[PDB]
Amino acid sequence: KQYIISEELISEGKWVKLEKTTYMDPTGKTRTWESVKRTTRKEQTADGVAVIPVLQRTLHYECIVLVKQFRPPMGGYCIEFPAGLIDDGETPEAAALRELEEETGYKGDIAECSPAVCMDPGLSNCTIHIVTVTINGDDAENARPKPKPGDGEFVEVISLPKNDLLQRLDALVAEEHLTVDARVYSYALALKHA
Amino acid sequence: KQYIISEELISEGKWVKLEKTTYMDPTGKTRTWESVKRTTRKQTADGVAVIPVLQRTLHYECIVLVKQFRPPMGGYCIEFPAGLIDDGETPEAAALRELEEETGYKGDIAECSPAVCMDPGLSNCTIHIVTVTINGDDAENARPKPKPGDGEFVEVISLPKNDLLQRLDALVAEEHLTVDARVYSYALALKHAN
Ligand SMILES: O=C(O)c1ccccc1OC(F)(F)F
Ligand SMILES: [Cl-]
Ligand SMILES: [Mg+2]
Ligand SMILES: [Mg+2]
Ligand SMILES: [Mg+2]
Ligand SMILES: [Mg+2]
Secondary structure, three states: OOEEEEEEEEEEOOOEEEEEEEEEOOOOOEEEEEEEEEOOOOOOOOOEEEEEEEEEOOOOOOEEEEEEEEEHHHOEEEEEOOEEEOOOOOOHHHHHHHHHHHHHOOOOEEEEEOOOEEOOOOOEOOEEEEEEEEEEOOOHHHOOOOOOOOOOOOOEEEEEEHHHHHHHHHHHHHHHOOEEEHHHHHHHHHHHHO | OOEEEEEEEEEEOOOEEEEEEEEEOOOOOEEEEEEEEEOOOOOOOOEEEEEEEEEOOOOOOEEEEEEEEEOOOOEEEEEOOEEEOOOOOOHHHHHHHHHHHHHOOOOEEEEEOOOEEOOOOOEOOEEEEEEEEEEOOOHHHOOOOOOOOOOOOOEEEEEEHHHHHHHHHHHHHHHOOEEEHHHHHHHHHHHHOO
16 A cells, blocks of 8 residues: 655765655655765665675584774774675675685685664665575685775774684673674574574 | 755655755765655654564464555555554654554564664654564463554465575565565675574
């Protein structure tokens, strides 16, 4: 029953824009909302990808590979899944593998790719694919991995056991006063709850 | 070593503002970033999202989710019940209140996350994720009564925990809904456990 009537540009930057969204509610009344969008989205199925990288090695507990970076909107450092925007013409899977190698030095193998999922749907239209990748840590390719960070990219790699993820994240928040990503926290909670 | 130097207001709506952040990169260079902030924050965080685990004897455990029209998405989304924390409210009380308004269920706090970031490349928005158990066999949860706000139109969807990821993938394939990325990450971790 609900649908968009109009989207009116309020302010556009190089990377993000704010819109006044007019939509029809299910009782037939017109209402408005203030919506954010990225300017960068072309024909990609999503703005970006986030990679769940399961590092697998013989005689080691599986690890979730995460990254720590300064995030200017947050005014501080955040722990997140490796992530980036999808390049024009790039598949989600290629972008996930590429971002994982750039951010961490690891070469992974695709396991699964989600449909487009929304990041904060009361605020923005931004979507990602969440791509699960295994890393064969016994392979020499993955022995002493070199990250290839881009222009103005400064990322630290943090590998935590899957079997103790939530507790190890709670420990980091207690020792370093950094922020954990909501998707990473949701994943760590479900690992506990199962 | 990285820090915020200044924040220039680009555009302020009633609910959302766009800002241009100047910050010092670690190579001593000044850089800028376009960021979104909500105009409603005071709190520990902008909001809460509730992970409600409906427990009913002789039944599978269910994760209780909501479906709504999200104007920024231009479509219907499936999400954890959620909202902004009122001034003076605690995360835990906002969790139980939102859960009751959106679904009718009266639950019990099990755990509460630190403030976690929603999309830290884009915004400063944060939430507490609050795990709540619902005793579906109590008489108060027999005929759950939602208390939705003016303009709020929320449909409750309870899905089994032990197949969640498969059930979501289906809702997407056969109802063209977008699943929230927190919900999805939770679902993936339930499969990825053990
Ligand atoms: O959008 C609708 O048609 C609708 C109408 C009345 C109540 C709930 C509704 O559904 C949903 F928005 F999903 F919660
Ligand atoms: Cl639980
Ligand atoms: Mg990135
Ligand atoms: Mg990057
Ligand atoms: Mg809500
Ligand atoms: Mg609400």
